[PDB]
Each structure stands twice: as C-alpha cells, then as structure tokens.
C-alpha cells in the first residue's frame, strides 16, 4: 500500500498472508471467508509468463498477523492447504480477467479476536454499495512505493471510480469481472495497493447491517499510485456463483 497507514490491531480479522515454505517469502495477501476457505487472486498461484505455478505444499497460510515479518508467537495461526481452485477461465494470457482462486485449508481454523471471516456480498448488497464515489478499504503488506517494506499491516480507503474513467486510463481490455478504484490526479488525496497486495481484499461496510463485505480482490494496476492511473480489482459478486459452486460442489 502507498500513502496508507498502519492498521489497528484486529481491524482486518480476515486478512491472510500467503507464504512460501522455501524461500520464506510472502508470495501475496488473501482473505478468510469461512473456517475452511481462503480467497485470493489466481495470478498469485498461476502466472505462466513469470513461470509462476504454485502447489498445495509450496505455500502456507498465516492468519491473524499484524507484523509483516515476525512470527507472532501466540496470536497467529499457520495453516496447510489441501486444494487450490483457480477460475476455470482465469485469463492469464490477456488481461487477468477472472483473477480469483479458492483454498481449502487442511483443517478449519478457529476464530479469535484477531481471526474472523469477512462476508461475501449478495446481489442487493453488491448492488447498493458498488457505486462510484463510495469508498472501500484495501489492506496489505506490499511495497510502500511502486519501486520500501512496511513493519505492520497497512490500510488505505479508496473511492470506486466509474467504469468509463477506468477504461480511458488504460490500453488494457477491461472486462465486467473488473472494477477500478483510486483517486483522480485532482481529488487531492492518494493511495493505492502495490506489489505484494494482490490476492488481498477490497471490503466495504454495510450501512444496513453494519457488516463488512469483500467486494473486490486486488488484481493489477500499471504501477502503484501514479497520477491518472487506478487499481483494478476482481469483481467478487460477479464471480459469486462460481465461488458458491466450488464450496458446495466440494
């Protein structure tokens, strides 16, 4: 995150850390949606062009974190996976359209003050919130500038931008399973996710049931916090039925 802030303890109970066993690097971010499932960006696992192709036992999932680096000894939970599900039509060759995957943790995790699932939106919910001008919140441990690494979880609240503006800011083909958010070079504030944030959650707070809903997944952006450039997130509600379908189908 760029021009963010540090997250208060327990601010993002559902924020997950995708981590490789060897070397011991933070691959990407993620989110807890059940006691058995983590939701991420497909391109965190699978990205042929950079020879990326991770497996079940190449990664570990660290829930409950706050410090980026430290093994938070009594607070955090480290879980083994059991099965990565990429969308069937993730488009890694063209524009990363349908950048969404599901993880089945080896065993359920237990909730705490610091570990807690985020809701998945419903049509009416996606339908009253996913409106330009409305702010959402991104969380992560990624670079602090395009180009350096945070001590603690970072946070930044961004506006949703009308699709015409997102479209006219890139030469990349923008699909329906995508939304963009950020400030325009003029609104006077800034911030945006960056490398290391992908897989991470874009969440909104319901003004109706005071609940938190994940509306997007940090996807891509040309750079991090460049003027007249916005971040692109996977539209979780549009990929909804697929998501249900795998949890139930399995």
């Amino acid at each position: 995150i760029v021009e963010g802030s540090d997250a208060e303890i327990g601010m993002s109970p559902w924020q997950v850390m995708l981590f490789r066993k060897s070397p011991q690097e933070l691959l990407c971010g993620a989110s807890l949606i059940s006691d058995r499932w983590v939701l991420t960006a497909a391109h965190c696992l699978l990205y042929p062009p950079w020879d990326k192709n991770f497996t079940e036992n190449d990664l570990l999932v660290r829930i409950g974190k706050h410090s980026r680096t430290r093994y938070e000894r009594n607070i955090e939970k480290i879980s083994m996976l059991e099965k990565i599900y990429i969308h069937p039509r993730y488009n890694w060759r063209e524009n990363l359209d349908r950048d969404i995957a599901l993880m089945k943790l080896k065993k359920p995790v237990a909730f705490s003050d610091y570990i807690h699932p985020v809701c998945l939106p419903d049509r009416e919910t996606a339908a009253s919130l996913l409106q330009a001008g409305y702010k959402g919140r991104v969380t992560g441990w990624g670079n602090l500038k395009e180009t350096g690494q945070p001590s603690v979880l970072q946070v930044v609240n961004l506006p949703i931008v009308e699709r015409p503006v997102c479209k006219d800011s890139t030469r990349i083909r923008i699909t329906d399973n995508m939304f963009c958010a950020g400030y325009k070079p003029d609104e006077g504030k800034r911030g945006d996710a960056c490398e290391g944030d992908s897989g991470g959650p874009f969440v909104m707070k319901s003004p109706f049931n005071n609940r938190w809903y994940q509306m997007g997944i940090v996807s891509w952006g040309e750079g991090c916090d460049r003027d007249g450039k916005y971040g692109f997130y996977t539209h979780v509600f549009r990929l909804k039925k697929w998501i249900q379908k795998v949890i139930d189908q399995f």
Binding site: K21, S22, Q24, E25, L60, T69, R70, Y71, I78
Partner: peptide, 10 residues
C-alpha cells in the same frame, strides 16, 4: 528478512 518459523509448519 523473516523470523524462522517452527518446523511444525514445514
């Protein structure tokens, strides 16, 4: 620049 993690994890 991570702290080792218990081998219980690998």
């Amino acid at each position: 620049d991570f702290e080792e993690i218990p081998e219980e994890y690998l």
